């Protein structure tokens, strides 16, 4: 899907996490964030379409999503341990990584 679409999918699941009561609801929404992050990583923006994969611009674009995914995975570790509130606090911190990965390319 579109980059704008994946940014919305991430924003929708972050709200779900903030409103969640249990770890399984957090786990589900983080799972869907990870999928959207890996999808967004494929949605090369038009201004970058003709860049080489080896290019520094494409390194920057792709690795913003590796970093988002890294911390989604860390949050999933907390959810799978049933630490709902800790996982919710990690998710709040995903907003900054999401911004860093997506904002300047929209
Ligand atoms: Fe990090």
Question: What is the spatial distance between Cα 51 and Cα 47, in angstroms, rounded to a whole number?
Answer: 9
| Among 41, 58, 40, residue whose Cα is nearest residue 49 | 58
Which whole-number Å values give the CA distances from 16 to 12, 52, 101, in the listed order?
A: 6, 37, 21
The burial of 56, by beta-carbon neighbours within 10 Å (0-12 exposed, 13-18 middle, 19 or more buried), is given as exposed
Question: What is the spatial distance between Cα 104 and Cα 38, in angstroms, rounded to a whole number?
Answer: 18
Question: What is the spatial distance between Cα 106 and Cα 92, in angstroms, rounded to a whole number?
Answer: 21
| Six token digits for residue 72 | 């989604």
9 Cα: distance to centroid of ligand 1 (angstroms): 21
| Domain containing residue 18 | 1-106
71 Cα: distance to centroid of ligand 1 (angstroms): 7
Domain count for the chain, please give it.
1
Which whole-number Å values give the CA distances from 12 to 23, 32, 61, in the listed order?
A: 17, 10, 22
| Among 37, 30, 12, residue whose Cα is nearest residue 86 | 30
Give the determination technique: X-ray
Resolution (A): 2.0
69 Cα: distance to centroid of ligand 1 (angstroms): 10
SS (HEC) of the chain:
CCHHHHHHHHHHHHHHHHCCCCHHHHHHHHHHHHHHHHHHHHCCCHHHCCCCCCCHHHHHHHHHHHHHHHHHHHHHHHHHCCCHHHHHHHHHHHHHHHHHHHHHHC
């Amino acid at each position: 899907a579109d980059l704008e679409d994946n940014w919305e999918t991430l924003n929708d699941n972050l709200k779900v996490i903030e409103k969640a009561d249990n770890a399984a609801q957090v786990k589900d929404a983080l799972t869907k964030m990870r999928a959207a992050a890996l999808d967004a990583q494929k949605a090369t923006p038009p201004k970058l379409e003709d860049k080489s994969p080896d290019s520094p611009e494409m390194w920057d674009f792709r690795h913003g999503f590796d970093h988002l995914v890294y911390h989604i995975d860390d949050a999933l570790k907390l959810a799978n341990e049933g630490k709902v509130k800790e996982a919710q606090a990690a998710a709040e911190q995903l907003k900054c990584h999401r911004n860093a990965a997506i904002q300047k390319y929209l």
